[PDB]
Every structure is written in C-alpha cells, then in structure tokens.
C-alpha cells in the first residue's frame, strides 16, 4: 500500500483534543506502544472522502523537522482517520496566551518559536507550496518547546472570528493582493508570517482586535502596518516591516527571515 | 415540451454577429419567416450542456419590454442553440461609440437609453435576481432606439480588458464590497447602473481608461467617484452620486432611479 | 399527465413575494390554464428533495376546498422545480393581522376577526375529515386575499421567514403552537391541531402576536407543559376565549372537535355584536 | 477490513443463549484463539443492508475504544448470517439483576462504592471523548468475577427492561432538559449517573417505582428529587444531589464525582 | 431529432451510382415526397461509431445552411445502414469535369464570369459565417441545368482527383501561410478562390500541371504567381492577383471580388 | 509488478526543481530502492493524461543507456501521478550552456564542448537503433550532472518553460530544430532527429543560443525551408561545422547517420586540440 495505512484495531482513543464541523481530533495510543493525534472525519460524503485521500496522498510525501509528522491514514470504514505525532502543548495561539503576562517567555524562547515556524515555512516555499492560512492557531507546540506547522484542521470553526463570510478568509493575516486581487503565493505567506511574528510578540492577540472584520480590511488595504509590540525589539519589528512590503516582490524571502531569526535566537 | 424547442431545420444561418471562447452568435431566419439571433455553443461538455439547459430553463420564464426576448432552445445535437429576437444595432457600448462626437445623440435620446436600461434592471430587482456584470456591452439596441439587457453572452472574450484575472471580474463596474468582501446584490447592481449611466453620457468610454486594472481598484476602493461628463447634467450626475453611495443601504432603489430618469426623458 | 403539469414556457415571473433556504416564491402570469398565480420554485433539488416535492404534488392534486389554497400544477421538467398555486394578494395572515391591527381603515372589526377564524376552522375541518394532520397550523401558514378570503397556505419556507416561532432538537418544531403530548411525546394528531387552532384563535384576537412573546423558547415550554394557558386578549369576548379553552384541554380526548369549534365560530360570526 | 478485528465463525462454539431481543440474541460461546476461552456473542439475524451497515459502523467505533470499565470488544464477523459481535463474557450479567440478588447477603458500603466508582470511571472515559451514552442505567452495566463492573453499551435493554421506558426513552434516567428540550449532553449523562447511584444504593429499585411513566415525568420536571436511600451516607447523597442540579452547567463533572467515589470506595465514611 | 430533416429509406429508390470513394458512394435516386423528383444520395458504409457521430454532426450543421450557391441538403437517415445524406441532384457534376468538356464549343467570357461569380457568391456566405472551407477547387463545385454552379461541400475528392493533393493537402490551391504555418482563414480561402478563377479561365487545367507536387510548393512559397490565361481579360487577372497577395491582410475580401465578378458577369469587358 | 512501482511513502519531497501546465518536478529522497531522485508529478490527471502517463512508464521501463536519464519507477496509486528518475544535479543542458559560457571557472573548453556533444549523440544512437524517433531533441531536453555527465532528459514540460522555441498550428512544434520535411510534410524520422542533432551541436558551440534568435518563428521557417544554414559559431572549428552540414543535408537519405556523427565527435573529443 503506497500511502501508510494504520489499522483501526492498532488505535485506542484516550480523549478528545479538539472539534469542528467536519472533524474531531483525539489523543490515542498507537500499537507497533506510542501516543499520537487522530483526525476523525465523520462527515464522510464521497467528495469529502476523495478530498481526504488526496490530502493523505500529499502529506505522505512531506517530511520536515517543523512540519507536524504524518504517520498515515485509514479509509477502512468510518470515521476516516488521519494519524499524526501528538503535540502535547497544542496550538501555539493558546500556548502563547498561556505563557504570557496573563512567568512569561524569555526573548530567546519567543525567537526560537518564530525561528522554528520560519523553518517550516522555508520547507513549503522551496516546494513552491502555498499554505494560504498561516497563524499561531495553525502551528503546534510539543515537549522541549518544539514548534511545527499543524497544517489546517478545523480552525475555521474553533477560532471563528479570525475569518469572514463571502468562503471564510483569514483577512487579518492576508496582504492586500490576496484581499483585493485574491492572489495567494509564497510572498503572501511571508506577509502572513510577519503577522505570526506579531502574534508571538503580543503573546497571541488577534491582529487589529480593537477593529472588526470590515474595518480591519480598510486598514490592511490603506497600508497601515501593525504597531511594534512592547515585548518587541525594533530589529525584529524590522523583520515584520520587511514581510509587510505592499509590493510582494520587495518582501523578503522566508529563507532570509529564517537566517536573521536563527542568528538572533542564538545571540540576542 | 416545457421549455420552448426550436427545430434546427426551421433555422437558416445568414451571417456571424459575434464570437467568444465557448460560443458564437449568428443572424438567422426562423420559419414559423422572421430574423433572430442564435447563440451557438460548440464547446459542449456535459457540465456545459447542463449549465445551458439550466440557463434556458430560467430565461423561458423571464419576459420584459427591456429584457432581450428568448424564443427558445435546441439541445438536439450540436452545436447547442439558444434563439433570441434580433437586435439590429448590436451592443450599446459599440452603439454609443458609433453615435457620439467620434451627429451625436439628443440628451432626450441619452435619457431614453438610461431609462430603458433602468426599466430592465427594475424587472430583475423585483425578482431579487442579481445580474453581477451590467455594462453597455451587455445591453443591446434595436430599430426605433429600443434598448434592452442582452444578459451576458461571451463579453469576457470580446471586451477583454474590462475584466481582470484571479475568474474574470468587471472591476471597473463593481462597488467596493463586491470587490473587497465579494458580496453581489441588487445594491451592487444599482452601483453598476451608475457606471452604465456614466458610459452612456461619455458615449461609451471605459471607466478610468486613463488607469490600469490594479490602480483602478485602489481608486474605486479609496472612494474616488468618476468625473461628471461634459454631455452630463448635474441633475443626472446626482443620480450617479446616488448610485455610488459607499454604503449599499444608502444607495437609491433602481425603482426611483427609473422614475427620475423617465421623468427627465419626457421633460428635460 | 396524472398530476397536472404546467409548462415552464406558460410562466412569466413578475416578481418575488417570499424567500427561503429551500424555496423562493414569485408572483407570475400563467398563460392558458392569462391569469395571476404564485409559483413555489425550489432551487435546492437533491433527489430526496426532488422526491419529497413530487410526493407533495401527488397529495395536493387530490385536495380541494373553499379554504385550502388552490393548487394548479407542478413542473419537474428541469430546475428549478415549480409548483403553481392561486395568487392570494395580501399574503400570510400573520403579517396581515400585524398590518391591520392597532399598530383609517383602522383595526379589523370583531366580525372580521370572527370571519377570519371561521374560514381557518373551515379549512381545518376538511383536513380532520381526511384524518390529515397539519402539524404546523399558524397565521404565518394561512394566506389572505381580496375581500378577506382566508385559506390554509400549507408549508412553504416558514422555518426561515418566522424563525423565532420554532426551537431546535436537528428538527425545528413550532413549540409555541404545540400541546404537551406534541412537545413531550411528539404525538401529532387531529387533537394536537385543534390545540394549535386555539393558539391561532389567540393570534387572530391579538392582531398576530407570538404566543408567550415575553418568554424564551425554553421557558415558553415550561409554561405550556406546566398547564399555564395564554391570557384572554383585550379584543377577545369571553364566548371566544371559551373556544380557546375548549381547544386547550390537557387530555386530547376531552378537547373540542374542530367541527364543533367551526360551528360555534360561524354562529358567533353571524350573531349581531354586543 | 483487516483493520477492525475479525473473528472467524468456525473459531466460535455456541454454548447457550444468555439473552434475546427484537434485533439481537446474545449467547455464551467458546473462542479458539489461550487455546480456548469464553466470550459473549451478539448475533443479529434481522440483517437488512441498513442494519448491516450500522453493525459494521458500531464495530468500527468499538474497535477503537478500550477501558478497564467499558465491556471489552474482541471483534466482528460480517462473513454471512447471523452478523456476529464478540465481547468478553461477564459472568454475573447486568448490574441491575446483580443488585437485586445481592440485597435484602446484602453488599458492604465499601462494595456499593466500588460499584459506583467503577461505573463513574467508564463514564469519565466517554466524557473524555465527548461521547454521550444517552441510556446509562444499572441494566446497561455488566458484572464479572471479583465484582468487576463495566458499561455494556449495546444490546436489547428496551425489550428485557420494558417498563423503564415510555414510547422509547428512559424518562426515569433523564433530566428535565432531555425530557423537555430533547437535549443529551455529558451533562444529561451525569444526571443519569446520579440516578444510577440511587439504583446501586437501593439494591436495584426502579426510580419512582411507586409512580406511573406519565406522573414520573411530572415530578422530574416539577423539581422533585429522589429520596436518600437507607443504605446511602449523607456524603453519597451530596454526590447524587450534585448530579441533580436542574442547571446542566451547575451539575458536577463526572471527573470530580468519580474522584470522590473512588476516594470513598478506598476509605468509606461511617454510617 | 425531428429537428434535423429526416428522409425515410423507403421513400428512396437508387437509380445508379454517380461516384465512389473510401468513406462514401454517391447515387442518383428518386425521392417520393412533387410526388417524385431526383436527388443525389451520399451513402457511408464505413460506419464506425466515431464516423456515425461525425455524419450526424455534419448533417446537424448542413441543416442550418441555405444559399443559392451552396448545394441544397434535403436531410439524413441514421435509421440503419448505410447512413444516408440526401442533396439536390446537379446534372453536370463537378465544375472541373464540366470545364474540360466545355473548352477547346468553348464557353463565352460572359459564362465563365457567371461561373466565377456563382462560386464567389457561395464563398461570400461561408466568409459571412466565419466558416473556412480549406479545400475550395472546381472539383468541389457542382453544375446544374441552366449553368447553375454551387459549392458541393463534402464527398471523396481526394480519392477521385488524386494527384491534386500530396500526403493529403491541396497544395496547388493553398497559400504560403497554409503550406508553411498550417494556417487556414477566410484569407487562405480567398487565395484558393484566386486559383479557382485560374481554373475556370483555363477550362480546368491543374495549377502548375507542368511541375511535380514537391517543386509546386517551391514556386508557391518563392513568390511566383500563375500565368494570365489566354481566355482571361486583364481586369480578371487583376482579381486573381488581388487574391494572391502574399500578405493575407493585403488580399481582397471575397465580398469585393464577388461584387466585381458579378458586375463584369452582367457587363463584361472586351477581349 | 511488471513496470516498477515506487511507493509514495518511500518519497520525501525536498523542493521544486521545475514547473509546467501538466507537471511539476521535485528533488526528493527515495528510501530503499536513502538516495536522491527527481520526481515528475502530474496534478493534471484526466484519464487520457493518466493513460498517456502509464504508456510512457511502460516504454521507459525497458529503455536503458549510459546517456538516457535513468528511470526508477512510477506510482499511479492516487494523485498526483509520480514518475521517479535519477537526479541530474546541474539540470537542463541549455540553462547549463548559458550559465557556463562567455556570459573562473570561465567558459567550457572545446574538449568539454565535444565531450558534451559526444554524450548526446551517444544517447541518440541508442534511440535510432530501436528505430525510436525523439521529435524534440534540444539542449533544454538533455540533463547535466556532477562532473559533466550528459543524458537525454526526454519530454517533461518543455513547451511551457522554453515557450518561444515552439510555434502554434493546436499543436506546438520546435520549428527552429526541424528540417523542411518535418515542417512542410510533418514527416518525423531518424533522419529528422539527425537534423535536430546538428541544431543541438550548434546550440552547444554557441553556449545555448536559440537558433535564428534574431528572426521570429515565421521568418525562422522561411530561412529553414529556403535552405539557409545557421552561421559557424565563433567557438566552432571547421571539422565540427562539417558535422552540422553533414546533419543539415536537404535530402534525408543524403544526411549522415547518428552512428557516424557519433564516431567523429568521439574521435575529435580524444584528438589533442589545435
Ligand atoms: O497534537 C495535535 N493537537 C493538540 C495537542 C494537544 C492539545 N492540548 C493538550 C492539553 O492542553 C491543551 C492542548 C491540543 C491540540 N489541538 C487540538 C486540535 O486543534 C489544535 C490544537 C495535533 C496533531 C496533528 C494534527 C492536529 O490537527 C490540527 C492541527 C492544527 C490545528 C487544528 C487541528 C492536531
Ligand atoms: O441581437 C443580438 N446581437 C447583435 C445584433 C447585431 C449586431 N450588429 C449588427 C450590425 O452592426 C454591428 C452590430 C451585433 C450583435 N452582437 C453580437 C453578440 O454580442 C453582442 C453584440 C443578440 C441577441 C441576443 C443575444 C445575444 O447575445 C449577446 C448579448 C450581449 C452581449 C453578447 C452576446 C445577442
Ligand atoms: O400568494 C402567496 N403568497 C404571498 C402573496 C403576497 C405576498 N406579499 C404581498 C405584499 O405584501 C407582502 C406580502 C406574500 C406572499 N407570501 C410570500 C411567501 O410566504 C407566504 C406569503 C402564496 C400562495 C400559495 C402558496 C404560497 O407559498 C407559501 C405560503 C405560505 C407560507 C410559505 C409559502 C404562497
Ligand atoms: O456477558 C454478557 N452478558 C450476560 C452475561 C451473563 C448473563 N447471565 C449470567 C447468569 O445469570 C443469568 C444472566 C446475562 C448477560 N446478559 C444477557 C443480555 O442482556 C444483558 C445481560 C454480555 C457481554 C457483552 C455484551 C453484551 O450485550 C449486552 C450488554 C448489555 C445489555 C444487553 C446486551 C452482553
Ligand atoms: O449531384 C451530385 N453529383 C454528381 C452529379 C452528376 C454526376 N455525373 C453527371 C453525368 O456525367 C457524369 C457525372 C457526377 C456527380 N458527382 C459524383 C461524386 O463526385 C462529385 C460529382 C452531388 C450532389 C450533392 C452532393 C454530392 O457529393 C459530392 C460533392 C462534391 C464532390 C464529391 C461528392 C454530389
Ligand atoms: O533532475 C532533473 N532536473 C533538474 C535538476 C536540477 C535543476 N536545477 C538545479 C539548480 O539550478 C537550476 C536547475 C533543474 C532540473 N530541471 C527542472 C525541470 O526541467 C528539467 C530540468 C530531472 C531528471 C529527470 C527528469 C526530469 O524531467 C524533465 C527533464 C527535462 C525537461 C523537463 C522535465 C528532470
Ligand atoms: Zn484500514
Ligand atoms: Zn431540437
Ligand atoms: Zn414541465
Ligand atoms: Zn468472517
Ligand atoms: Zn431513418
Ligand atoms: Zn503506488
């Protein structure tokens, strides 16, 4: 079997970690004994099943120190199962909110986070693979402050106001061309990584929380940047400015963002 | 047969009136002897055939003095045929360009045009039917300066620069919410009718012709209106301002636009 | 041929009268059968929905009454599916009671309020006689025409338009109009519909207020299941209120028959006023 | 479908029927492949297509569940008729029939708490998984050797324990919001666990036994709680009353309830 | 498919074969339902599924065409084998075989212009419809009573008039852009009409008859025009040279060409 | 089993090497068979495309040569379809000739230019011997690895990436690389490919310029069909140019055999320089 198939029998559900409109996710033990995360899709129309096959067909091939690991799939009945490594501390947005002045985190730790996500994004960009909804909700955090990108899931249900109706679009993380022209690239993803870099250094506020979805857009579009955070070096806020270039071409490569971050994270 | 079926044999092609990527349109004579327009779709995948059935199923029911008349359809082989009344003077955008200082038209005639399109739009709005691409290219002109709305056709091919890639969207005719939020209503159609009213009173210039598709958007969005035309009364340019309200709710009803226009067109 | 089929081409839409997740409804012209009608058009149209739609035409093509909205035919020849009905110019009785109440002419007479209730009761006697059970009787679901002719305007898309009248479970149930056995047990009978009629009679005499409008759906239930009966409206004579009570007995067996309800409302209708 | 665990029919020997219903029979049987051992076999002879899909659905789910206090499921066979589901055999049967047997020798407070704790444990697992049981009662629990108690999820209880429903919903096990608004949550289950607790400490009485199905509903909704059993310490009645808050939100977690019950079980109070 | 016009096989009587090919035979036949009249019947016995769809395609198209100077098409039958297409019978056959017959009694200048005009008229209709013929020659035109000439669109010319192709493209009827860039437009047709004109005024010579298929191509592309026929007035040679501009865009419309030819036909020049 | 199948799970993508309407191409890791490869992935994948893709695997699974890019297997187990090949680190010979020409190290030696031409000719002898006809020989369609190993890197998505090298008809044909009979008649043979090779030899000796780069596609045709032969490059000794002429004879029969072309290029390769 070309894609990796895990047998249902080799899985034991332990508890629920998260819920959506299509999916649930559980902690479970896998035999052949280790813990894992299981995306159970119970809303299983053939359109949705095929989508789920296509998704597994892709993830089977991806592999990076900062892409949440995919162990495999079982379309042997219902619900449809996708199996990943368990990330013990969850999604980064809830993690930042935990571990912030509501002690906080060492500026080296905030830099290691940023760094570790940038790595993951360096992998996707060399693949010319566009993510289209990067955010701290869509990254995961494991033992030993390991961070990785936990692709999508059902974040649109969970973190509801972050998106907006039309489709549900993460407008607070999107550059203007993605908004206006609807173009999604590598360059729009960098932009979103600038917004991520903000999230990390605000210990996980919603971008423009003060503002609502329809006025949020008039801000992003009218070219107003986001404020430098208290916890934020101007060096770092330079990196953000370098992500936010109005013009996609004049924005930095995620490769260079990744180098500056990894340089700072060692030697702040 | 519930939809009106015309027999191929009862049609004789005379010449080609227009061309696209999906369709052609011909002048032909219909027996049971009169002239007509025939949309011949030769690109006939089942997805496209079904779409074409759905379209005929709808038009069979619509009927208005300012909606180009639909005589019927034949899916009896290939190419798929839709039959309409022949409009002798074509699309209004080419018509305005003909009959303008490149004599021109009596301000009563420019008002009769505007008026006659507004009627057509009054019919669609009471049906809560949203057109989504109104323009002078998408209206037609017959003997005795009769104007009607000639729904779509293949205008995206013919009048190419009027749209923009993503889908092809008539950005120069769209309000900001249609642009930004992607919402299309009755209220966005009125807005587009304001732009139409402009086209008529510029004898058919492209909105923001000076400007290109990506800067055109920064204009519409930043709330800059279009200049009052030379040939244009301020009364009329009041009607346009009343279509262009940033806020869809504060825009006029097409019913009221239609009354003011019909009032002026009698008594300028 | 068995069910009557209208041709699409014999239809000209004029405009929209009403809107729903499942259906829209237009005023149209109908050629042959020129005369006006209302067309229910369903652009939903799976096959489960396409079947239900044929099933309903198969039923409605056999019903006929002075006070059941008249059904002319159906066309399943493509999309959207079409069901053609008589046009009732003044629409749904709820919006009509609200239009024409203390909120000239002025508010309906008592005699007109009675004439309205008699005509609904009339429609409902026909259904009970077929041992047919409506399950959602309400003024929103009766229609009103020229010179105050009133008829039962069946389903449509009531759960979308008058959304706060229903409560969730994923069934949406007209809790405010339902007796205890229909809430608790989900037993819907002719006797549950008589209950609902009582609630309609209240709507009528309050120019179309939501029953227990001051209560949420959950405390609305509490009040109903506990026994609490709605207040006599300011407009409601005590003969009429007795009717409502008649319909609101807790034991289904003990409730009045729509046939009796209907003769008393007709009697009162004809009787001179105070 | 090597994925769910398949048992071969040939590796079963039916010994005798334990129980009977409208959709199932259950038999004690011997399973080859531990060369031999006893199991209980759910056999469905109804067996439409609609009913065979639900049976392969239920088994696909049960395959993944595992807990000291959820009836162990060994596997399934849909190679022909009847459809088989194989579970561990629990020697003493349903906890209701066990409680009537072992009550006025009667069971020690320590034992009744073990029983309550063991059920509660099973309910912690289901709540963990945000999985609603909807029909938790002593009759839907089974009892093994060494007073092991587990939850016995599917079967034909509505046929056997007929009067405990009304037409069919276990109204005596149900809170006002389940009865009135048809709402089932981990909160409505806790309510039912409250009643289960009552059942244990009454050695298996039907709640409101003295009232009919209609007037039962009336007391539930009107606010009226069940009476403190003779056998029930006031600490344990606190636990019952915690589960019986009218406001779902104000009702204890199963996780606390289980933690108290497990503590008391190992270190009971005087009474 | 009441839509295209169907002829019943029973209402046909085959009289004799006129012609023969790899995909067709054509017969003269009598059509009942004008109780009786002659027609030509294209009969295809090849008749794959691929080839039956193209035949119902071609007929669906021909049904809609109508012109004084396009071979009239009466209808079709795909009720079995062979597949039938029915056309008006044109008594004198292809205009090439007619031109060789009627040349050195020879035809009047007035008549040759009528011929050129009548073909041109047919080509105006196709250009009107933005419809490219791709293989316009005297052999693909037919001639009726009273020197009526029309275009005889489909058939088996490549089989009969074999040498006029190369392996198969009518390179002697084709402009440099058709040969070199495989481009067919109403412009490349006009080019071919130019050659057709040559053919008329040479009483049916093959263009470059004296050259082989390879070296023909070489003269076409190198720029070299065909010679003014003896029978061809300089006004008419102007028309030929107009159609032979190397630049498609600089080549006359068929509509002008037709207008001149029709004028000259009614009012010829001296020669 | 017949054709070799690689498992998807035995693939880790590392990054993208190239892109097209039909295909992308990644550098990957391949486990078992750890070693590097190039994976052709087609996300197009109708069935006409899915079949062509199986047909090509069925052919490529039988070819094997020192100078035909090595084919490891294919997986049709889902989307996207996968074809696994040896990784050639320095990519397509055209981009490589342009990299490493007058536009240190410095521009390739004559000996290296000859070593490159010999290796292509070598690959092309194998195809002619199978009487297989490439139809699009060009430096864009040969691949270059570690220490100047060169191989024929078949199709891919050449018509998208090197789009101006082709001309329309809706077929896209490498007009600049085609002899008269292939332009005019569309006759593609071993003899047409030898022609193309001559054009490759010119590309090689011009560090990868487009033939007739100063002419449009239509006047490029004129010049070819008229007889006009490309200029001797500044880098090209007259022995080598004689080779090109050898390949550019107008009569296919009169042209040299790739086998001869290949022995002369190998001879020159070994010969000491001036
Ligand atoms: O390991 C995963 N996720 C996880 C692990 C642990 C936890 N809790 C541990 C205890 O304290 C609270 C957090 C929560 C999550 N989730 C649930 C899914 O929503 C993203 C947060 C995981 C692994 C692979 C895929 C996966 O699916 C996703 C990924 C991102 C966003 C949504 C779903 C989740
Ligand atoms: O009557 C129709 N259209 C027409 C009539 C006449 C003419 N010419 C007459 C001679 O001087 C030039 C103009 C041109 C058109 N067209 C072609 C299609 O593009 C819209 C202009 C007609 C009728 C029904 C449907 C229809 O399809 C449309 C409608 C709008 C836009 C595009 C196609 C066209
Ligand atoms: O004729 C019908 N109905 C009508 C007539 C008129 C009007 N407006 C008149 C102007 O002031 C506002 C109301 C509204 C309706 N509707 C809309 C759909 O909601 C039922 C009321 C009609 C006739 C037969 C069937 C039918 O479908 C229904 C009926 C009731 C409820 C839902 C659908 C509607
Ligand atoms: O082992 C099982 N159950 C059992 C064991 C033993 C006995 N007897 C022991 C000796 O004195 C007489 C009773 C009775 C049962 N039943 C039969 C079905 O009614 C549930 C009690 C068993 C194991 C797994 C699943 C299963 O299916 C159920 C579970 C609950 C309710 C109904 C069926 C039964
Ligand atoms: O009536 C038709 N054609 C005809 C009439 C008569 C004659 N003879 C008349 C007496 O001296 C001998 C020749 C020959 C033809 N053919 C046969 C097929 O080769 C095209 C000339 C005719 C009518 C309609 C369609 C049709 O099919 C074609 C048309 C052009 C070329 C080939 C077939 C033929
Ligand atoms: O290994 C292969 N190819 C490669 C290796 C490396 C590189 N880059 C290295 C860094 O500097 C830029 C070039 C590029 C390619 N490509 C991309 C696809 O276009 C063929 C060149 C390869 C191996 C086998 C088959 C294959 O598919 C082809 C080959 C040629 C043309 C099209 C597809 C590619
Ligand atoms: Zn499986
Ligand atoms: Zn037809
Ligand atoms: Zn119909
Ligand atoms: Zn089996
Ligand atoms: Zn026939
Ligand atoms: Zn595979």
From chain A, the residues in CB contact with F8 under 8 A are 2-3, 57, 60-61
Which of C13, C14, C15, C17, when mutated, tests ligand 3's pocket best, judged by the most ligand atoms within 8 Å of its CB?
A: C17
Q: Are C235 and C207 in contact (CB under 8 A)?
A: yes
Contacts of E146 (CB under 8 A, 6+ apart): none
Structure-determination approach: X-ray
d(CA B212, CA B77): 43
d(CA F141, CA E136): 41
Assign B232 to helix, strand or coil.
coil
d(CA D68, CA D148): 9
Q: Searching chain B, which residue's CA lies closest to the CA of residue E63?
A: B9
Atom of ligand 3 nearest to the CA of C83: 25
Q: Which tokens sit at B190? A: 């009125």
| Total CB pairs under 8 A between chain A and B | 23
Q: Are A13 and A35 in contact (CB under 8 A)?
A: no
Q: Are D121 and D113 in contact (CB under 8 A)?
A: no
Residue of D94, D135, D153, D189 with catalytic role: D135
- Strand pairing partners for E73? E87
Q: What is the CATH number of the domain that holds A223?
A: 1.10.510.10
Neighbours of chain D (3+ CB pairs under 8 A): A, C
Hey, how many other C-beta atoms are within 10 angstroms of the C-beta on D101? 13
Query: How far apart are the CA of F235 and the centre of ligand 3, in A?
Result: 87
DSSP letter string, C169-226: ----B-GGG--HHHHHT----HHHHHHHHHHHHHHHHTTSPPTTTTS-HHHHHHHHHH
Smallest Cα–Cα separation from E268: which of E145, E146, E109, E34?
E109
* Nearest neighbour of C9 by CB, restricted to B2, B53, B126: B2
Q: Which range of residues forms the domain containing residue D208?
A: 93-267
- Nearest Cα residue to atom 30 of ligand 5: E152
The reply to whether ligand 1 has any atom less than 6 angstroms from the CB of A23 is no
Q: Is B25 annotated as a binding residue?
A: yes
DSSP letter string, B28-86: EEEP--EEEEEEEE----HHHHHHHHHHHHHHTT---TTB--EEEEE-SSSSEEEEEE-
Smallest Cα–Cα separation from F194: which of F112, F116, F250?
F250
How far is residue A88 from each of residues A37, A67, A141, E170, measured CA to CA in Å?
Answer: 10, 15, 7, 76
Contacts of B170 (CB under 8 A, 6+ apart): B133, B135, B162, B163, B192
Contacts of B113 (CB under 8 A, 6+ apart): B92, B96, B105, B145, B147, B200
F16/chain A closest Cα distance in angstroms: 5
d(CA D174, CA B193): 61
What is the side-by-side order of every strand in the sheet holding E141-143? E93-94, E141-143, E149-151
From chain B, the residues in CB contact with C15 under 8 A are 126-127
Atom of ligand 5 nearest to the CA of E89: 1
Query: How far apart are the CA of D142 and the centre of ligand 4, in A?
Result: 7
The reply to whether ligand 1 has any atom less than 6 angstroms from the CB of A18 is yes
d(CA C267, CA C43): 45
B162/chain A closest Cα distance in angstroms: 15
* Nearest neighbour of A8 by CB, restricted to D57, D63, D129: D63
How far is residue D75 from each of residues D1, D31, D45, E124, measured CA to CA in Å?
Answer: 12, 11, 17, 80
Q: Is B114 annotated as a binding residue?
A: no
CA angle D19, D22, D27 (to 5 degrees): 25
**Helices (H) then strands (E): counts for chain F:** 9, 7
Contacts of C173 (CB under 8 A, 6+ apart): C166, C167, C183
Give the distance, in angstroms, between the CA of residue C266 and the centroid of all CA atoms in the same chain. 19
**To one decimal place, what's the resolution in Å?**
3.0
d(CA E137, CA C162): 74
Q: Is A21 annotated as a binding residue?
A: yes
Q: Are F151 and F142 in contact (CB under 8 A)?
A: yes
Q: Which residues line ligand 3 (CB under 6 A)?
A: C 17-18, 25, 38, 40, 69, 85, 87-88, 91-92, 141, 143, 153, 156-158
Q: Searching chain B, which residue's CA lies closest to the CA of residue E126?
A: B15
Contacts of E185 (CB under 8 A, 6+ apart): E132, E248
Query: How far apart are the CA of C65 and the centre of ligand 9, in A?
Result: 26
From chain A, the residues in CB contact with B180 under 8 A are 179-180, 217, 221
d(CA F154, CA F88): 13
CB contact under 8 Å between E57 and B74, yes or no, is: no
Q: Which tokens sit at C89? A: 């110019």
CB contact under 8 Å between D128 and A19, yes or no, is: no
Q: Is D11 tagged catalytic?
A: no
How far is residue A257 from each of residues A111, D262, F202, measured CA to CA in Å?
Answer: 12, 54, 44
Q: Which tokens sit at F231? A: 């200029």
Q: Which tokens sit at B159? A: 């009048």
A74/chain F closest Cα distance in angstroms: 14
Contacts of F207 (CB under 8 A, 6+ apart): F97, F98, F100, F101, F102, F103, F107, F108, F235
b/e map A94-128, b = 16+ CB within 10 Å: bbbbebbeeeebebeebbbbbbbbbbbbbbbbbbe
Q: Is D25 annotated as a binding residue?
A: yes
| Helix H or strand E encompassing E240 | helix E234-243
d(CA F219, CA B216): 39
CB contact under 8 Å between E64 and B7, yes or no, is: no
d(CA B199, CA C124): 58
Hey, how many other C-beta atoms are within 10 angstroms of the C-beta on A180? 20
D147/chain C closest Cα distance in angstroms: 38
d(CA C163, CA C210): 12
From chain E, the residues in CB contact with F167 under 8 A are 181
Which of A153, A155, A162, when mutated, tests ligand 1's pocket best, judged by the most ligand atoms within 8 Å of its CB?
A: A153
Contacts of D78 (CB under 8 A, 6+ apart): D52, D55, D56
Whether chain B has a CB inside 8 Å of the CB on E68: the answer is: no
A125/chain D closest Cα distance in angstroms: 36
Ligand found nearest the CA of E135: 5
Smallest Cα–Cα separation from F154: which of F256, F32, F71, F242?
F71
Task: Give catalytic residue positions of B.
Answer: 133
Q: What share of chain A is helix, strand, coil (3-state, %, to 5)?
A: 40, 20, 40
The reply to whether ligand 5 has any atom less than 6 angstroms from the CB of E71 is yes
CB contact under 8 Å between A12 and D129, yes or no, is: no
Hey, how many other C-beta atoms are within 10 angstroms of the C-beta on F128? 20
Could you give the count of Cα atoms lying within 13 Å of D27 in the half-sphere of its Cβ? 14
d(CA E157, CA E134): 13
d(CA A122, CA B67): 55
Whether chain B has a CB inside 8 Å of the CB on E132: the answer is: no
Assign E19 to helix, strand or coil.
strand
CA angle A209, A211, A215 (to 5 degrees): 140
């Amino acid at each position: 079997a070309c894609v990796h198939h895990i047998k249902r029998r080799d899985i034991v559900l332990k508890w629920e970690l998260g819920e959506g409109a299509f999916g649930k996710v559980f902690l479970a033990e896998c035999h052949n004994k280790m813990l894992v995360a299981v995306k159970a899709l119970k809303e299983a129309s053939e359109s949705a099943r095929q989508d789920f096959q296509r998704e597994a067909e892709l993830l089977t091939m991806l592999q990076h120190q900062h892409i949440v690991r995919f162990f495999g799939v079982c379309t042997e009945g219902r619900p449809l199962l996708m199996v990943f490594e368990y990330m013990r501390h969850g999604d980064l947005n809830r993690f930042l909110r935990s571990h912030g002045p509501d002690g906080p985190l060492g500026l080296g730790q905030l830099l290691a986070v940023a760094s570790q996500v940038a790595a993951g994004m360096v992998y996707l960009a060399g693949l010319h693979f566009v993510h289209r909804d990067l955010a701290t909700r869509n990254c995961l955090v494991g033992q030993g402050l390991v961070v990785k990108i936990g692709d999508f899931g059902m974040s649109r249900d969970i973190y509801s106001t972050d998106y907006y109706r039309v489709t549900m679009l993460p407008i607070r993380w999107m550059p203007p061309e993605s908004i206006l022209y609807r173009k999604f690239t590598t360059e729009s993803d960098v932009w979103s990584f600038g917004v991520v870099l903000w999230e990390i250094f605000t210990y996980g506020k919603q971008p423009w929380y003060q503002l609502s979805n329809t006025e949020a857009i008039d801000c992003i579009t009218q070219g107003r940047e986001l404020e430098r955070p208290r916890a934020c070096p101007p060096e770092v806020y330079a990196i953000m400015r370098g992500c936010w270039q109005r013009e996609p071409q004049q924005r930095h490569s995620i490769k260079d963002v990744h180098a500056r971050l990894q340089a700072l994270a060692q030697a702040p």
